[PDB]
C-alpha cells in the first residue's frame, strides 16, 4: 500500500531558522530520514525513529507515536539544505525540498 | 531489627539465561569410534539420550528462536566435524592434468521411457548426453612412467573455454581456485539423529505450547536433560526428514512485513518424495602416487535415460493449498501466488540434497507453479542433475570430490517444511500475493527444530528472611 | 520460606510454587548440581572445560558457605540482622506467594552487602569463641 | 565394627582383618584417595582426564557425606534405624569375623534404600532444629 | 597470634605486620586462593593444567583441615599439646614481633610431626565421642 | 619405587588372558611409534626406476 | 633463476636535482636488487610460463 | 627509568657478560623506504599464490 507520504514538499527557510518536515507511515515499521546534498550522494541522518546517525550534530531530531513522525532541524545552516527522504524497509517518500533564502 | 534476620539457602531452584558448550549425545548406538564413521564416531559420545521430561506447575518463560545460539553451536560443530574428517583423506592435486574429452558412446542399451533401443545420446538425453568421456595422462607410482587412463565426468565438473574455444581440452573446475580432497570410503556418514545434553549445572527448558509463533512467552513449559533426536540433514528450498506440528501448518518469521526475512513454513502432514538414479554405475579405480587411489565412474551399464524425483500430485497440491490458506490468514484480503525460483546459484536455484553419498540437484519449476491459495484448477516428475565436485557449504572455501556409488541408487524422504521469501517493491495492488522458494543457511534448517529449547544456568544459592537468629531468638512475622 | 524436603522429584520440577513450598527440593538441586552426566579429536578439551567449570562453580559456592559457618548444611541460620537500609520488604508475599524465581529479582542490586555482613559477623563470632576458650 | 584409628600403614595394608580392626585405617585411605601421584603430544588429555575423574569422584563422595550430616568426620553416627525389612543380619560375624571386603558384598542390593533414608532423616532433623531456634 | 579479621584489603596487603597484626586477611586469602582468574591451539592444555593444579591444591588443604576436625573454620583450636621436644620457642616475639613470613621459617624442620599428632588426637577424640554416644 | 605392601588374609582371583593392561600397552606403543614417525622424512621421491 | 641488472623507466632521484641516469650511480634499492625470470608450473602441471 | 641512565650486568669485570644500558629519555628514530613497491602476484599449484 502507500506506506510513506511526506509533507510539505516545498519549503523556504532562511539560515539559522528551524525547519519542520512530517512523514506519515501507514503501517507499523521502522522509520528514518535522509539528506540529499545537491548533486551528491545522499546519506543517512536519523534511523529507528529518533536515534541520530553517526557524526550528525544535535540539530537533527524527531519523534513519533504510531503513524505520524515530525522531523525538526534547529538552526539549519547553509550547507545543511537539500532534499530529505522518508524510508521504511523498501519504500521512499516523495521527498521534501528546502531551499535557502 | 529485633524480629528480622537473614538466612542462607542452598540448592534453591533459580536459574538465569547464560550460554555454554553442550554435550553431543548419540543414538545409543550406531557408532564405531575408529573403524568407520557414521556421523561422529571419532568425536561424539555414545550415551543414553533418554529425555526424561518434567512438567512445571506455574512457570512462564520467554523464548526466541532467532536468537537461539544452539543453532550457531550446531553450525560450528558440523563445520569442525567435516573439516577434521576430510583432513586425512586423499588430495586431488595430481589429477589436474590437461584432459581431452569427447561425447560418450553406448553399447546398445535400452531406454526406460520409450519402447525402443538406444539410438543416439542427444535424444536419449539423461545421464548419457550430460556426461563427457575424458582421457588424460597420469603419473604411475614409479614417477618415471605415465599411461593413458580414462574416466567419465559430469559436465559441471569440467571447464572448457579457458583452454581456448577450439581445443576440446578441459580442466577440473576446482583448480582455478583451490585443491579438492576425496571423501574417504570407510568414513562415509549419514544423518544419524543427534541429541544435545546440557553440561552439569545447566538445564535445557522446552516449550510445549506448539502453536506459539517463535517468540514471546510460553506457559506449558517443561524441563529436559537431553533434547530429542535432531537429524543433521541439509537441503535447500525444502526441509525433509523433519518433525511435524500437532496443529495444522505453522509459519514463523521475525517480521512478515520485513520481506527480506525468510519465512519458514512447518507442515503437519508429510508429503512423500522418492528420488532415484537408474542405471548401474561401474566404479573405476585408477592409481595415483605410491599408495593413493582415485575413484571415478567408468561405463554406465543398463538402461540410462533417467534421473528423476517423484511426488504425489494431490497430496502436495492440498499441502500447498493449506499453506496458502494460512498465508491468506496472515495477509488479509489478498490472494497467494507461488512462482518459480527467483534465481541465484545452482545450489539454491534448485532443490539440493544427498542420497547414498551422491549429491542431487533438481529443477523445482514444476512444483511451485501455483495460483490463488493453491494450484490451478498422477505424479509430478522433477528433472534433476548431479555434481561430484562440491563446495562444502553454500560458499565456504572447503571443496570436495564425491566418489561415485555403483549400482542404481534410490532414496525416500518425508517433506515437512518449506523455505520461502516474498516479492519486494510495490506496486501494492499486484505484489503482495507473490511468494517464491528461496535458499537457506543451515541455521534456517536447524531453527525449525531448535525453536523449542532454551539453555539456562542454575543459580543454586539464595538468601531470604526467616524466623531464626543463630542460637539466640525467634521472630514475629506476616502471612498472605 | 521453609519446608520438609524430598528428593524423589529427580530435578527442577518446582520451581513455580512459593518459597515455602519450593524450599523442599534443596537435596535434589544440591545433588544434580555436580553429579553426571558421565582419529585425533579436540572435543576432549571441550568436555574437560565443561567439567572444570562445573567443579569450580561448586567449589566457589561451597567456599562461600564455609566462610559464613554454613558448610555442612543446606538450610543455615545466621546472626546478621536485616539491615537498617530495608525495614520494608514484603514478607506476606515472601512466605506463601512469591516463588524463588521471582524473589531472586527483588534481592538483586543488594546481594553484595549480604556476603560482607555475613563474613564480618562470622569472623567476629570466631574470635569471640577463641576469647571464651582462652579463659578456662 | 570400630577401632582406634591409625595412619602408619602407608596404604591399603589392611584389608583382610575384621571390620573391628580394618576400621582403624580410615585416615590413610582417605588421604591416598586424592593425593598424588603428581613434540606435540596428546597424553596431557589422558592425565587431565584421570585427575578430573579422581577429583569428581572425591567431590561426589564428600557431597553425599554432607547431605547426611556427616561432612567433617570419618566415623559418623546417624539416626536412621535398622531397616524394618532386614532385622536379620549376622552381627556376631560383623564385629570380629567378616572383613570389609566380605561385608560389602552383603550390604549390596539394599544400599540404595539407605542413601534415601539418611537424607530424609537429615532433612527432617534440619527443619526441626530450625523450628526449635525459631521458637524463642 | 589472633585478631578481628577483614576483607576490604582485596589481597595480600599484610604481610609484613606481626602475626597478631597479620592473621586477619584469612577471609580474603581463602577467597583468592581458588577464585578467578576466569586455528587449532594447545594452550587449552596449559589453562586446564593450571586450573586442575589449583583445584587439587585447595582440595588437599581442605582435606588436611577435615582430618583434624577443623573443616568449616579458618581459625581452629585443637587438643594436641605443645611438643615434648620443643618447650622453648620465643613466644614474646610470636605475639607482636614476628610476621608470618618469618615465623614460617622457624616451624620448618618440625611441621611434619604436627600433622601426625593432630591426626592421632582427632581420631582418638572421634572414637571417644562415638563410645560416649554408644554408652547409654 | 614400587613400595610393596603385604596383606594378611586377602584372597583374589587373577586372570592373565583377560588382563586389559596388555591392550593398554598395545595402544600406547602404537600411538608412540605413529606420533614419533609422523614428522620424519617421506620416501615418495625415491620411488624412481 | 636467470637474472640480470634492473632497468628504470625514467624515474627521479631524491638525493640530487637530476633525473635517474644509471643504477650504478643511482645506487640504492635499484642496483642492490636483481631482476630474475624463471620457468614456473601453471596449475594444470603440463604447461609452464 | 625514573632516575638517570642505568647500567646492568651480573659482573662488569666479567667482560664477556652483556651490559644492558637503560635510558631515562627516549631518542626518536625515523626509518623509511621511499618508492612505491608494486606487489606482483604469481600463481603456484592449484590454490597457492
Ligand atoms: C531420510 O529418511 C529415510 C528413511 O525414512 C532415509 O532412507 C535411508 O537412506 C539410506 C541412505 O541415505 C539407505 O541406506 C542404504 O540402504 C541400502 C539398502 O538397504 C537395504 O538392503 C540391504 C541389502 O542390500 C539390507 O542389508 C538393509 O538392511 C536394507 O534392507 C544399503 O545397501 C546401503 O548400504 C551401504 O551403506 C552402508 C552404511 O554406510 C554401508 O555399511 C554398506 O556397506 C553400503 O555401502 C545403505 O545402508 C537406507 O536404506 C534408507 N532407508 C529406507 C527405509 O529407505 C534417508 O536416507 C533419509 N535422508 C534423506 C536425505 O532422505
Ligand atoms: C516416477 O514417475 C515416472 C512417471 O510417472 C515413472 O516413469 C515410468 O517408468 C516406467 C519404468 O520404471 C516406464 O515403464 C515403461 O513404459 C513403457 C510404455 O511407455 C513400456 O513399454 C515399458 O515396457 C515400461 O513398462 C513408464 O513408461 C514411465 N512412465 C512415463 C510416463 O514415462 C517412474 O517409473 C517413476 N519412478 C521413478 C523412480 O522415476
Ligand atoms: C527449470 O526448467 C525449466 C524448463 O526446462 C527452465 O525454463 C526455461 O528457462 C530458460 C532460461 O531462463 C528460458 O529461456 C528463455 O526462452 C525465451 C523464449 O521462451 C527466450 O526469449 C529467452 O531469451 C530465453 O532463451 C526458457 O524459456 C524456459 N522454458 C520454460 C518452459 O520455462 C528453467 O530455466 C529451469 N530452471 C532451473 C533453475 O534449472
Ligand atoms: C483454494 O484452492 C482450493 C484448490 O486449490 C479450493 O478448494 C477445492 O480444493 C479441492 C481439493 O484440492 C479441489 O479438488 C481437486 O482439484 C485438483 C485440481 O487442482 C484435482 O487434481 C483433484 O483431483 C481434486 O479434484 C477443488 O477443485 C477446489 N475447488 C475449486 C473451486 O477450485 C478453494 O476453494 C480455494 N480457496 C477459496 C477461498 O476459494
Ligand atoms: C633523513 O635525513 C636526510 C638527510 O638530512 C633527508 O634527506 C633529504 O631528503 C629531501 C627529500 O626528502 C631532499 O630534498 C631535495 O633536496 C634537493 C637539493 O639537494 C632539492 O633540489 C629537491 O627539490 C629536494 O628538496 C634533501 O636534499 C635530502 N638531504 C640531503 C642532505 O640529501 C631525509 O629527507 C630525511 N628523512 C628520511 C625519511 O630519509
Ligand atoms: C570412453 O573412452 C574410452 C577411451 O577412448 C573408451 O575405452 C576404449 O574403447 C575402445 C573402443 O571404443 C576400446 O578398443 C579400448 O580398449 C577402450 N579402452 C582404452 C583404454 O582405450 C570407452 O569405451 C569410452 N566409454 C564410453 C562410454 O564412451
Ligand atoms: C624485469 O625483467 C622483466 C622480464 O625481462 C621485464 O618485463 C618485460 O620488459 C620488457 C621491456 O623491457 C617488456 O617488453 C615485456 O613485456 C616485459 N614482460 C615480459 C614478460 O617480458 C621487466 O620490465 C624488468 N623490470 C625491470 C625493473 O627491469
Ligand atoms: C546398436 O544397435 C544398432 C542397430 O542394431 C547398430 O547399428 C549399432 O552399431 C549398435 N551399437 C551402437 C554403439 O550403436
Ligand atoms: C504452470 O501452470 C499453468 C496454469 O495455468 C499451466 O498452464 C502451465 O502449463 C504450467 N507450467 C508448468 C511448467 O508447469
Ligand atoms: C630516460 O631519459 C633519458 C633522457 O631523456 C633517455 O635518454 C632514456 O632513453 C630514458 N630511458 C631510460 C630507460 O633511461
Please say whether the beta carbons of C15 and C24 come within 8 A.
no
Domain count, chain A: 1
Cell numbers 535447500 correspond to what residue? B236
- Closest atom of ligand 4 relative to the B373 alpha carbon: 1
List, in order, residues 6 or more apart from B374 with CB less than 8 Å away. B317, B318, B320, B321, B324
Angle, CA of B441, B445 and B448, to the nearest 5°: 140
Please say whether the beta carbons of E22 and E14 come within 8 A.
yes
Q: Of all helices (H) and strands (E), which one includes residue E28?
A: helix E26-32
Partners of B10 in beta bridges: B461
List, in order, residues 6 or more apart from B51 with CB less than 8 Å away. B195, B224, B225, B226, B227, B228
Residue E84 domain boundaries: 12-133
Please say whether the beta carbons of D95 and D3 come within 8 A.
no
Partners of A35 in beta bridges: A43
B377 Cβ below 6 A of ligand 9: no
User: What is the C-alpha R_g of chain E?
Assistant: 19
Q: How many other C-beta atoms can be found within 10 angstroms of the C-beta atom of residue B436?
A: 17
By CA distance, what is G12's nearest residue in H?
Answer: H35
Chain B interface includes G47 (CB < 8 A): yes
Inter-CA distances, B241 with B232, B394, E28, Å: 10, 21, 57
Partners of D108 in beta bridges: none
Cell numbers 582462652 correspond to what residue? C134
Q: Of all helices (H) and strands (E), which one includes residue A33?
A: strand A32-35
CA dist., res. C11 & res. C32, Å (int): 7
CA dist., res. B209 & res. B218, Å (int): 7
Q: Do B142 and F45 touch (CB under 8 A)?
A: no
**Which subunits count as partners of chain A given 3+ CB pairs below 8 Å?**
B
Residue B1 in grid coordinates: 531489627
CA dist., res. D62 & res. E72, Å (int): 13
Residue A43 domain boundaries: 4-100
Residue F1 in grid coordinates: 619405587
Cα(B108) to centroid(ligand 8), Å: 6
Ligand in nearest proximity to the CA of B310: 2
Q: Which residues from chain A sit within 8 angstroms of residue B257, using beta carbons?
A: 27-29, 89
CA–chain centroid gap for D69, Å, is 12
Task: Report the candidate in C47, C4, C10, C1 with the shortest Cα–Cα distance to residue C29.
Answer: C10
Ligand in nearest proximity to the CA of B149: 6
- Closest atom of ligand 4 relative to the B320 alpha carbon: 5
DSSP state of C80: E
Cα(B112) to centroid(ligand 2), Å: 6
CA dist., res. B336 & res. C53, Å (int): 53
Task: Report the candidate in B10, B24, B66, B477 with the shortest Cα–Cα distance to residue B262.
Answer: B66
Is residue E50 assigned to a domain? yes
Ligand 8 pocket test target in B103, B105, B108, B300 with most atoms within 8 Å of CB:
B108
CA dist., res. B298 & res. B316, Å (int): 38
Partners of B111 in beta bridges: none
List, in order, residues 6 or more apart from C49 with CB less than 8 Å away. B21, E44, E48
DSSP-H helix ranges across B187-237? none
Q: What are phi and psi for residue B297, nearest 5 degrees?
A: -75, 125
Chain D interface includes C36 (CB < 8 A): no
Is residue D121 assigned to a domain? yes
CA dist., res. C48 & res. B331, Å (int): 51
Residue C130 in grid coordinates: 577463641
Cα(B377) to centroid(ligand 4), Å: 6
Task: Report the candidate in D86, D66, A98, B423 with the shortest Cα–Cα distance to residue C71.
Answer: D66
G10 Cβ below 6 A of ligand 7: no
Ligand 3 pocket test target in B307, B339, B365 with most atoms within 8 Å of CB:
B365
Q: In what order do the strands lie in the sheet with A32-35?
A: A51-52, A43-47, A32-35, A86-88, A91-92
Residue D32 in grid coordinates: 591416598
Please say whether the beta carbons of C91 and B467 come within 8 A.
no
B369 Cβ below 6 A of ligand 9: yes
Q: Of all helices (H) and strands (E), which one includes residue B461?
A: strand B461-466
List, in order, residues 6 or more apart from D12 with CB less than 8 Å away. D25, D29, F5, F7
Task: Report the candidate in C72, C24, C103, C27 with the shortest Cα–Cα distance to residue B462.
Answer: C103
Chain G interface includes H44 (CB < 8 A): yes
Q: Sign of torsion, CA E55 E56 E61 E67?
A: positive
Q: What angle in degrees, to the nearest 10, is found between the helix axes of B442-450 and B70-86?
A: 130
> Is chain A in touch with chain C: ≥3 Cβ pairs within 8 A?
no
Q: Do D17 and F9 touch (CB under 8 A)?
A: yes
- Closest atom of ligand 4 relative to the B376 alpha carbon: 19
Partners of B414 in beta bridges: B272
Cα(B249) to centroid(ligand 4), Å: 18
Task: Report the candidate in B411, B415, B449, B437 with the shortest Cα–Cα distance to residue B240.
Answer: B415
Q: How many other C-beta atoms can be found within 10 angstroms of the C-beta atom of residue E47?
A: 15
From C116's Cα to the closest Cα of chain D, the distance in A is 23
Residue B358 in grid coordinates: 551422491
Residue E4 in grid coordinates: 578481628
CA dist., res. B220 & res. B452, Å (int): 11
Q: Which residues from chain D sit within 8 angstroms of residue E42, using beta carbons?
A: 40
Task: Report the candidate in B91, F42, F44, B175 with the shortest Cα–Cα distance to residue H48.
Answer: B175
Task: Report the candidate in B257, B308, B250 with the shortest Cα–Cα distance to residue B127.
Answer: B308
Task: Report the candidate in B62, B78, B18, B105 with the shortest Cα–Cα distance to residue B221.
Answer: B62
Inter-CA distances, D7 with D13, D26, E119, Å: 11, 8, 8
CA dist., res. A67 & res. A1, Å (int): 14
Angle, CA of B241, B247 and B249, to the nearest 5°: 60
List, in order, residues 6 or more apart from D24 with CB less than 8 Å away. D3, D4, D5, D6
Is residue D5 assigned to a domain? no
Q: Do H45 and B178 touch (CB under 8 A)?
A: no
Q: Do F49 and B144 touch (CB under 8 A)?
A: yes
**Which subunits count as partners of chain F given 3+ CB pairs below 8 Å?**
B, D
Q: Is B218 left (phi over 0), alpha (psi -120 to 50) or beta?
A: beta
Cα-Cα end-to-end distance for chain B = 21
List, in order, residues 6 or more apart from E104 with CB less than 8 Å away. none
DSSP class per residue in E32-90 = HTTS------SHHHHHHHHHHHHHHHHHHHHHHHHHTT-TT-SS----PPPPTTT----
Q: Is F43 exposed, middle or buried (0-12, 13-18, 19+ CB in 10 A)?
A: exposed
Residue D91 in grid coordinates: 552381627
Please say whether the beta carbons of F41 and B135 come within 8 A.
no
Nearest CA to ligand 5 atom 26: G15
Q: Is B287 exposed, middle or buried (0-12, 13-18, 19+ CB in 10 A)?
A: middle
Angle, CA of E7, E11 and E13, to the nearest 5°: 95
By CA distance, what is B429's nearest residue in A?
Answer: A1
CA dist., res. A94 & res. E50, Å (int): 65
Q: Sign of torsion, CA B113 B118 B123 B127?
A: positive
Q: Which residues from chain H sit within 8 angstroms of residue G42, using beta carbons?
A: 43
CA–chain centroid gap for E115, Å, is 11
From A93's Cα to the closest Cα of chain B, the distance in A is 13
Q: Is B251 left (phi over 0), alpha (psi -120 to 50) or beta?
A: beta
Chain C interface includes B201 (CB < 8 A): yes
DSSP-H helix ranges across chain D? 19-22, 26-32, 43-67, 91-96, 100-106, 111-135
CA dist., res. B183 & res. B188, Å (int): 7
Cell numbers 542420497 correspond to what residue? B355
Ligand in nearest proximity to the CA of B307: 2
A37-44 long-range contacts (CB < 8 A, ≥24 apart) are A37/A82, A38/A81, A38/A82, A38/A83, A42/A85
Query: In 3-state terms, what secondary structure has residue G35?
Result: strand
Inter-CA distances, E48 with B22, C53, C131, D45, E54, Å: 18, 10, 43, 10, 10
B319 Cβ below 6 A of ligand 4: no
Inter-CA distances, B480 with B1, B465, B474, C95, Å: 21, 15, 20, 7
Q: What angle in degrees, to the nearest 10, is found between the helix axes of C111-133 and C43-67?
A: 60
CA dist., res. B58 & res. B62, Å (int): 14
Q: Of all helices (H) and strands (E), which one includes residue B84?
A: helix B70-86
How long a stretch of residues is chain G?
Answer: 49
Task: Report the candidate in B163, D80, H43 with the shortest Cα–Cα distance to residue G40.
Answer: H43
Q: Do G40 and H35 touch (CB under 8 A)?
A: no
Report CA dihedral (B426, B431, B434, B440) to the nearest 10 degrees: 10
Task: Report the candidate in B450, B390, B42 with the shortest Cα–Cα distance to residue B232.
Answer: B450
Is residue E1 assigned to a domain? no
Is cis: bond before C15, omega within 30 of 0? yes
Cα(G10) to centroid(ligand 10), Å: 6
Cα-Cα end-to-end distance for chain A = 36
Nearest CA to ligand 9 atom 7: B376
How long a stretch of residues is chain F?
Answer: 49
- In CATH, what number is assigned to the domain containing residue A13? 2.60.40.10
Q: What are phi and psi for residue A83, nearest 5 degrees?
A: -125, 135
Q: Tell me the count of G-H CB pairs closer than 8 A.
A: 11
Q: What are phi and psi for residue B203, nearest 5 degrees?
A: -125, 135
3-state helix, strand, coil in chain F (%, to 5): 40, 0, 60
CA dist., res. C49 & res. B199, Å (int): 10
Please say whether the beta carbons of C124 and E3 come within 8 A.
no
Q: Is C45 left (phi over 0), alpha (psi -120 to 50) or beta?
A: alpha
From D111's Cα to the closest Cα of chain F, the distance in A is 24
Cα-Cα end-to-end distance for chain E = 41
Please say whether the beta carbons of B415 and B267 come within 8 A.
yes
Is residue E118 assigned to a domain? yes
Q: Of all helices (H) and strands (E), which one includes residue B462?
A: strand B461-466
Strand B337-338 to A96-100 pairing: unpaired
Please say whether the beta carbons of D28 and D11 come within 8 A.
yes
B255 Cβ below 6 A of ligand 6: no
Query: In 3-state terms, what secondary structure has residue B62?
Result: strand
Is residue E75 assigned to a domain? yes
Strand B434-437 to B337-338 pairing: parallel
Ligand in nearest proximity to the CA of B303: 2
Identify residues after which chain F is interrupted (C–N over 2.5 A). Answer: none
Residues 4-43 of F with CB under 8 A from D: 5-10, 31, 35
Please say whether the beta carbons of B87 and B37 come within 8 A.
no
Domain count, chain C: 1
From G47's Cα to the closest Cα of chain B, the distance in A is 9
Inter-CA distances, E17 with E1, E20, E47, E103, F34, Å: 11, 8, 34, 12, 58
Strand A10-13 to A96-100 pairing: parallel
Please say whether the beta carbons of B299 and B283 come within 8 A.
no
Please say whether the beta carbons of C10 and B54 come within 8 A.
yes
> Is chain B in touch with chain D: ≥3 Cβ pairs within 8 A?
yes
By CA distance, what is E131's nearest residue in D?
Answer: D2
Is cis: bond before B130, omega within 30 of 0? no
Amino acid at each position: 500500500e502507500i506506506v510513506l507520504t511526506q509533507s510539505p514538499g516545498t519549503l523556504s527557510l532562511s539560515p539559522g531558522e528551524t525547519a519542520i518536515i512530517s512523514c506519515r507511515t501507514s503501517q507499523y515499521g521502522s522509520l528514518a530520514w535522509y539528506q540529499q546534498r545537491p548533486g551528491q550522494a545522499p546519506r543517512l541522518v536519523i534511523y529507528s525513529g529518533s536515534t541520530r546517525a553517526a557524526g550528525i550534530p544535535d540539530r537533527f531530531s524527531g519523534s513519533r507515536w504510531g503513524p505520524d513522525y515530525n522531523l525538526t532541524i534547529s538552526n539549519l545552516e547553509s550547507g545543511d539544505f537539500g532534499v530529505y527522504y522518508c524510508q521504511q524497509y523498501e519504500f521512499f517518500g516523495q521527498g521534501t525540498k528546502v531551499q535557502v533564502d | 531489627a529485633e524480629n528480622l534476620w537473614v538466612t542462607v539457602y542452598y540448592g534453591v531452584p533459580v536459574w538465569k539465561e547464560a550460554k555454554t558448550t553442550l554435550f553431543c549425545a548419540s543414538d545409543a548406538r550406531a557408532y564405531e569410534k575408529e573403524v568407520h564413521n557414521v556421523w561422529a564416531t571419532h568425536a561424539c559420545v555414545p550415551t543414553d539420550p533418554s529425555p526424561q521430561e518434567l512438567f512445571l506447575e506455574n512457570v512462564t518463560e520467554n523464548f526466541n528462536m532467532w536468537k537461539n545460539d544452539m543453532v550457531d553451536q550446531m553450525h560450528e560443530d558440523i563445520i569442525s566435524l567435516w573439516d577434521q574428517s576430510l583432513k586425512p583423506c586423499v588430495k586431488l592435486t595430481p589429477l589436474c592434468v590437461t584432459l581431452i574429452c569427447s561425447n560418450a558412446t553406448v553399447n546398445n542399451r535400452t531406454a526406460y521411457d520409450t519402447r525402443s533401443n538406444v539410438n543416439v545420446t542427444s535424444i536419449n538425453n539423461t545421464i548419457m548426453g550430460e556426461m563427457k568421456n575424458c582421457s588424460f595422462n597420469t603419473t604411475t607410482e614409479i614417477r618415471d612412467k605415465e599411461k593413458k587412463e580414462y574416466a567419465l565426468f559430469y559436465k559441471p565438473d569440467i571447464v572448457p573455454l579457458n583452454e581456448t574455444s577450439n581445443t576440446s581440452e578441459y580442466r577440473l573446475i576446482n583448480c582455478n581456485t583451490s585443491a579438492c580432497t576425496q571423501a574417504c570410503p570407510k568414513v562415509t556418514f549419514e544423518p544419524i539423529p543427534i541429541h544435545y545434553c546440557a553440561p552439569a549445572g545447566y538445564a535445557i527448558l522446552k516449550c510445549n505450547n506448539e502453536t506459539f509463533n517463535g517468540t514471546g512467552p510460553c506457559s506449558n513449559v517443561s524441563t529436559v536433560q537431553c533434547t530429542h533426536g535432531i537429524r543433521p540433514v541439509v537441503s535447500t528450498q525444502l526441509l525433509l526428514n523433519g518433525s511435524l506440528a500437532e496443529k495444522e501448518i505453522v509459519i514463523r518469521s521475525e517480521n512478515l512485513t520485513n520481506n527480506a526475512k525468510i519465512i519458514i513454513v512447518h507442515l503437519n502432514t508429510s508429503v512423500e518424495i522418492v528420488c532415484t538414479r537408474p542405471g548401474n554405475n561401474t566404479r573405476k579405480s585408477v592409481r595415483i602416487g605410491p599408495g593413493q587411489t582415485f575413484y571415478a565412474t567408468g561405463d554406465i551399464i543398463g538402461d540410462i535415460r533417467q534421473a528423476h524425483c517423484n511426488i504425489s500430485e494431490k497430496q502436495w497440491n492440498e499441502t500447498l493449498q493449506k499453506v496458502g490458506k494460512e498465508l491468506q490468514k496472515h495477509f488479509p484480503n489478498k490472494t497467494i501466488k507461488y512462482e518459480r525460483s527467483a534465481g541465484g546459484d545452482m545450489e539454491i536455484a534448485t532443490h539440493s540434497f544427498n542420497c547414498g553419498g551422491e549429491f542431487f540437484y533438481c529443477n523445482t519449476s514444476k512444483l511451485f507453479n501455483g495460483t490463488y491459495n493453491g494450484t490451478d484448477i498422477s505424479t509430478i516428475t522433477l528433472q534433476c542433475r548431479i555434481k561430484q565436485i562440491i563446495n562444502m557449504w553454500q560458499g565456504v572455501g572447503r571443496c570436495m570430490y564425491a566418489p561415485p556409488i555403483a549400482g542404481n541408487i534410490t532414496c525416500k524422504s518425508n517433506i515437512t517444511g518449506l523455505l520461502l521469501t516474498r516479492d519486494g517493491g510495490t506496486n501494492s495492488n499486484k505484489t503482495e500475493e507473490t511468494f517464491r522458494p528461496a535458499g537457506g543457511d543451515m541455521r534456517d534448517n536447524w531453527r525449525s527444530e531448535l525453536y523449542k529449547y532454551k539453555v539456562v544456568k542454575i543459580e543454586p544459592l539464595g538468601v531470604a528472611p526467616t524466623r531464626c537468629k543463630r542460637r539466640v531468638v525467634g521472630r514475629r512475622r506476616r502471612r498472605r | 520460606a521453609v519446608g520438609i524436603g524430598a528428593v524423589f522429584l529427580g530435578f527442577l520440577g518446582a520451581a513455580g510454587s512459593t518459597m515455602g513450598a519450593a524450599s523442599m527440593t534443596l537435596t535434589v538441586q544440591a545433588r544434580n548440581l555436580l553429579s553426571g552426566i558421565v582419529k585425533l579429536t579436540v572435543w576432549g578439551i571441550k568436555q574437560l572445560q565443561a567439567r572444570v567449570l562445573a567443579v569450580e562453580r561448586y567449589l566457589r559456592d561451597q567456599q562461600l558457605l564455609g566462610i559464613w559457618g554454613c558448610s555442612g548444611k543446606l538450610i543455615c541460620c545466621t546472626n546478621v540482622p536485616w539491615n537498617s537500609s530495608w525495614s520494608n520488604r514484603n514478607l506476606s508475599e515472601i512466605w506463601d506467594n512469591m516463588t524463588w524465581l521471582q524473589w531472586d529479582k527483588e534481592i538483586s542490586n543488594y546481594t553484595q552487602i549480604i556476603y560482607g555482613l555475613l563474613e564480618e559477623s562470622q569472623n567476629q563470632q570466631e574470635k569471640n569463641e577463641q576469647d571464651l576458650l582462652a579463659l578456662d
